[PDB]
Amino acid sequence: VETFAFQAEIAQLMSLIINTFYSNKEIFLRELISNSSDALDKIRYESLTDPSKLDSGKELHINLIPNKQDRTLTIVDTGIGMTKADLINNLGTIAKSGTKAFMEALQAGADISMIGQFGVGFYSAYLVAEKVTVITKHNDDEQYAWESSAGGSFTVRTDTGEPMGRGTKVILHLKEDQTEYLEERRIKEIVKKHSQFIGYPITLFVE
Ligand SMILES: O=C1OCC/C=C/CC/C=C/C(=N/OCC(=O)N2CCCCC2)Cc2cc(O)cc(O)c21
């Protein structure tokens, strides 16, 4: 298990998400689905130039899996996934600019729901989750587990759990007062409100 520090500006972003009083938390689901759709777009686009990129799985979809026993909401996609360098360095690097822009927009009157316009929507997970675990598999790398309870650090390790062929699974360990997002009717409402035209099938698992 390797432990890393977030870049200072991303630690600041996470603290702002965790500490700001902001009732409209449900948008976290739209931002993660949007990320999943973006990841699916990438593998699909690359597959047109190199069809062998789908040898690890042709299905392009998003599954929402609530588990009341574990108090987790899992968002599974079969997108492009993330390499180890993606997990530790690349996405963080790319996010520096968007985090800065987002912080500046909040100062000028934007609100937290607009986070996705800055390319850092993943961090909205911290509106509802005390800890987030991300399992991922990219064609060019091994399966990894990333995890963070914020506080300025994250971990990465090789994942020995069940193989996924390719994609990303975001496991939201929900805060104790955020269990509404395990309810079928609640998830259904939010997907219909915010994610109705996503161009991949979204399957809402029930319990
Ligand atoms: O695999 C994904 O993207 C790969 C292709 C890129 C697509 C653009 C949209 C993705 C935004 C993401 N931002 O993460 C920010 C970040 O530094 N982190 C550290 C590592 C763990 C994930 C979060 C990554 C991501 C998030 C997601 O909710 C679903 C996903 O399939 C992916």
From Swiss-Prot:
Chief place of localization: nucleus
Annotated ATP binding sites: 35, 77, 96, 122
GO-annotated cellular components: apical plasma membrane; axonal growth cone; basolateral plasma membrane; brush border membrane; cell surface; cytoplasm; cytosol; dendritic growth cone
Domain of life, per UniProt, equals Eukaryota
- Taking the record's annotation, the residue ranges forming a coiled coil are none
Q: Which GO terms describe its molecular function?
A: ATP binding; ATP hydrolysis activity; ATP-dependent protein folding chaperone; CTP binding; dATP binding; disordered domain specific binding; DNA polymerase binding; enzyme-substrate adaptor activity
> What does its PTM field state?
ISGylated.
State how changing residue 81 to D affects the protein, per the record: Abolishes ATPase activity
- Spell out the residue ranges making up region: Interaction with NR3C1: 1-207
**Keywords of the record:** Acetylation, ATP-binding, Cell membrane, Chaperone, Cytoplasm, Host-virus interaction, Hydrolase, Membrane, Mitochondrion, Nucleotide-binding, Nucleus, Phosphoprotein, S-nitrosylation, Stress response, Ubl conjugation
Oligomeric and partner information: Homodimer. Identified in NR3C1/GCR steroid receptor-chaperone complexes formed at least by NR3C1, HSP90AA1 and a variety of proteins containing TPR repeats such as FKBP4, FKBP5, PPID, PPP5C or STIP1. Forms a complex containing HSP90AA1, TSC1 and TSC2; TSC1 is required to recruit TCS2 to the complex. The closed form interacts (via the middle domain and TPR repeat-binding motif) with co-chaperone TSC1 (via C-terminus). Interacts with TOM34. Interacts with TERT; the interaction, together with PTGES3, is required for correct assembly and stabilization of the TERT holoenzyme complex.
What is stated as this protein's family in its record? Belongs to the heat shock protein 90 family.
Q: What is this protein called?
A: Heat shock protein HSP 90-alpha
Q: Which gene encodes it?
A: HSP90AA1
Say which residues of the entire protein are included here. Answer: 17 to 223 of 732
